[PDB]
Design a binder for this molecule. Structure first.
Ligand SMILES: [Mg+2]
Ligand SMILES: [Mg+2]
Ligand SMILES: [Zn+2]
Length: 250
């Protein structure tokens, strides 16, 4: 439920990211008003949100889509099927076409945060478009800034692709217990956590074969390891399931 979806987003970027739109067409009448408005604009990036895609444009509009059962994005050359065409984004060389999907809507910035589906699933830590600056935004946003990291880091509504084993490594790297909230953190701390939320998860994926003959480049610090000393201070790691060093984490 992760490796894919990001694949569709990348196909669409490769095809038209940064390229000026020469034609924009939507099948739905309520979307017609954005056509001439997008001409000359370009997709800045395509964000993944569960099985949904967010196609951002340089004028701050964001096309949201959820293929659900039938929708399919096809790339072609500007010029080129029994399926009903719903969206057509055309540049000089490449053109992307959305077929069948019914869940298609245009969103203004302020609308992102309130969309029912989007409030339920956040950006993926593995998504290259996700930047530490964005993470800080969500952390600080009035919707999360008051949540303890213990559960926040286990809630997909905040960030997708965050397994418990990652939650404990991230917190140990910034020296924090699960009881803190982004509101009580100073700038330096907030940024530290922001990078940790991305780097650790990504560093974990880009590795791992085998452990029976070779040890992975990425090693756990407190996941499991309970009852073992901490590499930093030497205190014995504990478990609650949270894993932490009560010695250098507070
Ligand atoms: Mg080997
Ligand atoms: Mg503290
Ligand atoms: Zn320690």
């Amino acid at each position: 439920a992760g490796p894919e979806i990001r694949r569709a987003a990348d196909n669409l970027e490769a095809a038209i990211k940064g390229k000026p739109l020469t034609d924009v067409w939507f099948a739905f009448p309520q979307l017609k008003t954005y056509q001439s408005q997008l001409i000359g604009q370009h997709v800045t990036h395509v964000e993944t949100r569960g099985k949904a895609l967010l196609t951002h444009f340089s004028n701050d509009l964001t096309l949201y889509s959820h293929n659900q059962l039938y929708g399919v994005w096809r790339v072609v050359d500007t010029g080129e099927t029994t399926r009903v065409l719903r969206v057509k984004l055309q540049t000089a060389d490449k053109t992307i076409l959305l077929y069948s999907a019914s869940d298609i809507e245009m969103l203004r910035p302020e609308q992102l945060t309130t969309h029912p589906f989007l409030q339920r699933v956040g950006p993926d830590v593995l998504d290259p478009n996700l930047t530490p600056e964005v993470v800080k935004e969500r952390l600080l946003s009035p919707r999360f800034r008051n949540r303890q990291f213990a559960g926040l880091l286990l809630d997909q509504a905040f960030l997708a692709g965050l397994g418990n084993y990652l939650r404990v490594e991230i917190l140990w790297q910034v020296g924090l217990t699960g009881n803190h909230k982004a509101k009580d953190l100073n700038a330096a701390q907030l940024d530290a956590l922001a990078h940790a939320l991305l780097e650790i998860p990504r560093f974990s994926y880009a590795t791992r074969g085998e452990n029976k003959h070779h040890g992975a480049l990425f090693r756990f610090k407190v996941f499991h390891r309970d009852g073992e000393p901490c590499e930093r201070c030497g205190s014995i790691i504990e478990k609650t399931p949270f894993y932490w060093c009560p010695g250098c984490q507070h």
